[PDB]
Amino acid sequence: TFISRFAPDQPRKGADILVEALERQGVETVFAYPGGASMEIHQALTRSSSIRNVLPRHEQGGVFAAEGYARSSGKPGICIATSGPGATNLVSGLADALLDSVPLVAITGQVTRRMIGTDAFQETPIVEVTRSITKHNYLVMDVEDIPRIIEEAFFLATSGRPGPVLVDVPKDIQQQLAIPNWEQAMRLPGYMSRMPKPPEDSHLEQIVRLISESKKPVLYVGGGCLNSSDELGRFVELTGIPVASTLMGLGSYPCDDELSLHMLGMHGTVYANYAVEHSDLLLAFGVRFDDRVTGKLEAFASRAKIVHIDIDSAEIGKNKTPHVSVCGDVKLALQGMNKVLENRAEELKLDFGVWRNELNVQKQKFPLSFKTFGEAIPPQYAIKVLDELTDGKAIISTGVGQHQMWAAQFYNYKKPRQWLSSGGLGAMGFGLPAAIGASVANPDAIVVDIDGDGSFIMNVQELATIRVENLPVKVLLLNNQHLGMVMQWEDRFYKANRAHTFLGDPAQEDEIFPNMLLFAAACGIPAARVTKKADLREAIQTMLDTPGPYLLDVICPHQEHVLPMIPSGGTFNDVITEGDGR
Amino acid sequence: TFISRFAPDQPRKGADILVEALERQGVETVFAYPGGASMEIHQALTRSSSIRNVLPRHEQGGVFAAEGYARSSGKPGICIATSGPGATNLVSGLADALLDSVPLVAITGQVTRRMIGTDAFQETPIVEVTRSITKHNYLVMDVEDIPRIIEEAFFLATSGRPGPVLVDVPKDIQQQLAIPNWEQAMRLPGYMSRMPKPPEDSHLEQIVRLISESKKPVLYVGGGCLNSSDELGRFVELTGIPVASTLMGLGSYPCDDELSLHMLGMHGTVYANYAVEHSDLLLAFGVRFDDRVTGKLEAFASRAKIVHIDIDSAEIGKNKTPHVSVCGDVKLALQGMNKVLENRAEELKLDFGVWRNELNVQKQKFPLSFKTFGEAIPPQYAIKVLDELTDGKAIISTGVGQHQMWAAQFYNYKKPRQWLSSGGLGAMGFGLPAAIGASVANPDAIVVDIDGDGSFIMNVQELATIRVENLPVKVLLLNNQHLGMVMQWEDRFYKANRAHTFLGDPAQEDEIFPNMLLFAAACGIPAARVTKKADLREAIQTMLDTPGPYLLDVICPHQEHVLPMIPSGGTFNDVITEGDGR
């Protein structure tokens, strides 16, 4: 039973109704940067005893923190910004949350209703701007609509295929007094009628039928399974089907497991892509057949009967056409199939040991590998050490590029929501703010941002946030002085012709530039650099053991390449397994 | 006569046609951050001998630098970004260029034409996103359209009311070979037919008629006069009409002049707003009657006959209704009126010395003023010293907030395009990147970014750009540890209740946090802090005299308030002339 801070017959500002609407949704933390058009909302926030604000240093930091909070917890992330430049600074995070299906509620102040459309001070038509990069959005045109719109926004952000919802609030509405009605019905008839039903036995029985008729089945699991860890693990017990995972799926099934093929796709393992190439049954659970995974679609799982279970009917049959499909929550489908697989266990007698052995041979002939050169630190190796000293139990966020691939390849995620990474939009500068949100949501966890030097500098101002919020964020900075992934493509496809990929100072080209230790020092954050592989284990242990935030600058030879690699639009037969920038 | 690097019968990549299209427009400098979907464009850029790239550390830095380049030079600023997160990171700069009418051409890489609409890797529907915040934009659907679209984009960005134009280029189009045709006609029939004619004598003669019948005329000049410095100065010679200027107009008429009323509006001088309040003729040249200037519209220039000259007919009669108008280039109108005023000089005998004296009394009773407390540095005073040691000849860029108002109030701009400031959107984080673009366009000028500690940290990563580009950018950081302007409004309208406006570390609240000197040190930029007013003159001289970039952290009491202040929607009779946070 909720207790308002206001008498139920007492008028209060729209801003106060908006904050109480958040309290009534269970919101505990928001990421809010104030300005003129949201001041009223900030004033109302100080009157709340149950909502904490984490002040970022840039609204892009605020929205990426909100995403970290959501991805690391399964709760919606809440960001708040002023009008105009506040709102436009959210845009990369909105697009990012929409592409990765992350639940987010973004609230923007706006000029007054009578000023809308007049090229007013700090006016942006943010509802127009963000229509194509949000799941839904709203312009509040009457203070009495605030309760319903906030309720609809959380409902839409968190139900179905999750995503971002933006709510735009004119300053005059924030100031208007009213008595809220907390019992209005949501006004979403179409969306609620198009919500998937629980899966039917008919369809689940057909999937189990297909499994029992198959000799080479592969599971293809993605971000849709992040709430299905238990059900999926049980399903693999009852079937012994080996598991390939997308970049968004990492940790749905444990990486340190004998049935795990690890990641498939452009930079997937040779054995994961082999499994899919030669499978005769493809169980695609919570995946969207993106071409970073599939390569050339006609060549992808070309001898497989394809089962697709997705909560979004628009995904089913979009790129690849399944033989069987379920439109619904993969968690319910797994539960239902598990009962069938348990009851008919002795009748079914499922054994894929011959397929599993065929894959385990590929696993032994073509494992993930890296070279050690003299005493230079291999980035791959630094991530393996971090895995060992954290016992695969850290929350890992990353930037985008080679280090992101290595954080996926060389750390064994044990649970979903340990891995926080921008996959569909691939936004640099995500890792540090995302780690801020993850640490706020999981204040007892080990939180490590595995970052690149180009990604890290983009939202470096959030080091200040980490300090004043006294968050124990660890930064494993893999520093190769380049835009590594663009550099790799220059090496393989442009004859190593460099086009603006070097991030250091060309006037002193053998100096580490910038000196990231001084960024940390500027914000009172302990830091160290490590250059020799022999010093790595101790350096990483110091970072872990030192209380509070810590930056470790890990210097890496820049000629490393992420392998394997299927070029864009290619087939398994195109996989590249050797080479680097030397 | 232009010399291609390609034979005129030789096919080359669309990327190479795009770069040569820029060369043919006279482009010398671009601000380009590479990614996968723009790599081809970056490769083609390295093949150009005439185009230099300035690599920013964040695309928001790139676009704000492009704006600095444009505002400081009168040329279009050119920024280039990859697809997806590259493109979304431009958005605040696009909206900013559209609100301040800054010419800008933004080029974004895009996924291939067949991938558009498939939720592809790093795909953003950027043409949809930016339609309402650009003057125009384009999606290139055929390599043969590149010459025409680039020509149209520069034409639209620079003609008429200038603004940003975005061009979105699919990666397959960048790779396609073709032979460009450099002689296609622009396809802009409607826009070119709606282009204003040279002003008619009928309308110019009526304006001079009104002047000669007036006893209290005021000039109200804005960003539209930035190319009319000579004509406007001559016009003031022939008429002796005193000049009030908007924040975007600063320097069109010299600040250090006896006829200058300085800035009008919410934070205008008492005498400028008085002049307008009591005028009987308002000459509104290159201004858009924004309500940061007008306050309550009915009360604004309520006894004046209003003349409005604007290049955009949509502005004429929008907010205030003129008695006379010219739709056209204010530079041509001034030239035309100057001939009339010269020929009929002895017949007209214009003398407003009685009005000018009435204003000069207001100038003496209510000048701009500040308090000095002990040995604390007044920010107002620090800007006056900078004015003196630079002889009012520096290019000044700023962030947004109190320091922005003080940079407008206490520096005497002598020419247009010395002042680079975000006025309509008011985007924090603009000052440092804008100074980068200004220094690249004016490599011999004194370039000073007068910044606040909240604005400065937002794009602090561009310190790296300044270093490797070896740009002599000076940073006068006015550091009050707060979001000053939001703090001021908290003081006057919310009983000093602080809602997330303190930027320092509350655990050690009397320490300067962060330590901006270490940000500069991280990027190899000389820096110093100054805290005592007696040390200010020397500290600023050191910054000016030390070659190359330099950061000066100027510590300021946070209780300062920008005065005067007409509250939003108010009238002259509401002006606030005293008070602060003490």
Ligand SMILES: Cc1cc2nc3c(=O)[nH]c(=O)nc-3n(C[C@H](O)[C@H](O)[C@H](O)COP(=O)(O)OP(=O)(O)OC[C@H]3O[C@@H](n4cnc5c(N)ncnc54)[C@H](O)[C@@H]3O)c2cc1C
């Ligand atoms: C540099 C770089 C390289 C990359 N290379 C690779 C790569 O080699 N391999 C790779 O896998 N990725 C790679 N990507 C990531 C990539 O672009 C996509 O982000 C990823 O492939 C898509 O993940 P997904 O298929 O799991 O779909 P998601 O984006 O995770 O979407 C989840 C899907 O499940 C559905 N869903 C959600 N909830 C449920 C539910 N309860 N029940 C049923 N369905 C549900 C949604 O409707 C959607 O279809 C790379 C990214 C970058 C930046």
Ligand SMILES: Cc1cc2nc3c(=O)[nH]c(=O)nc-3n(C[C@H](O)[C@H](O)[C@H](O)COP(=O)(O)OP(=O)(O)OC[C@H]3O[C@@H](n4cnc5c(N)ncnc54)[C@H](O)[C@@H]3O)c2cc1C
């Ligand atoms: C914190 C803050 C406080 C502010 N307070 C103030 C304030 O007290 N005073 C103030 O003035 N501003 C203030 N502003 C700035 C403000 O919001 C607007 O940016 C400014 O008032 C508008 O400038 P402008 O009228 O010159 O129009 P601009 O934005 O400069 O537009 C120029 C106008 O001229 C036209 N034009 C362009 N070229 C030509 C040409 N060749 N011939 C004819 N017409 C042309 C365009 O069509 C347009 O109508 C403040 C901003 C901030 C961030």
Ligand SMILES: COc1cc(OC)nc(Oc2cccc(Oc3nc(OC)cc(OC)n3)c2C(=O)O)n1
């Ligand atoms: C905190 O410092 C400042 C400064 C400033 O102008 C310099 N504005 C704002 O808030 C706004 C932000 C955006 C639009 C605004 O316009 C506005 N808002 C109103 O809300 C009631 C009324 C109004 O009357 C014109 N104008 C306003 C505004 O508060 O005027 N805050």
Ligand SMILES: COc1cc(OC)nc(Oc2cccc(Oc3nc(OC)cc(OC)n3)c2C(=O)O)n1
């Ligand atoms: C499927 O076939 C194609 C063809 C093509 O251009 C011919 N583009 C794309 O998608 C992209 C979309 C966006 C960026 C792209 O470049 C890119 N993609 C990467 O995927 C991980 C990495 C990378 O590193 C530089 N560049 C690519 C890219 O496939 O080149 N796919």
Ligand SMILES: Cc1ncc(C[n+]2c([C@@](C)(O)OO)sc(CCOP(=O)(O)OP(=O)(O)O)c2C)c(N)n1
């Ligand atoms: C906001 C933004 N701008 C540009 C991007 C385009 N990309 C990339 C890619 C893969 O999307 O190909 O396009 S990755 C990348 C370079 C990575 O820099 P690093 O972290 O310091 O080095 P690391 O050694 O790769 O770990 C760029 C420039 C991007 N995604 N986001």
Ligand SMILES: Cc1ncc(C[n+]2c([C@@](C)(O)OO)sc(CCOP(=O)(O)OP(=O)(O)O)c2C)c(N)n1
């Ligand atoms: C991207 C962005 N986010 C928030 C903004 C809303 N505003 C402002 C305003 C005037 O637009 O009122 O809204 S000014 C301001 C605080 C200024 O920080 P400072 O430079 O360190 O301190 P100074 O002492 O004022 O010089 C904020 C938070 C903004 N405009 N841009």
Ligand SMILES: [Mg+2]
């Ligand atoms: Mg605002």
Ligand SMILES: [Mg+2]
């Ligand atoms: Mg069947």
Ligand SMILES: [Mg+2]
């Ligand atoms: Mg080793």
Ligand SMILES: [Mg+2]
């Ligand atoms: Mg790097």
Ligand SMILES: [Mg+2]
């Ligand atoms: Mg790209």
Ligand SMILES: [Mg+2]
């Ligand atoms: Mg008349």
Ligand SMILES: [Mg+2]
């Ligand atoms: Mg003094």
Ligand SMILES: [Mg+2]
């Ligand atoms: Mg930044």
Ligand SMILES: [Mg+2]
């Ligand atoms: Mg400040």
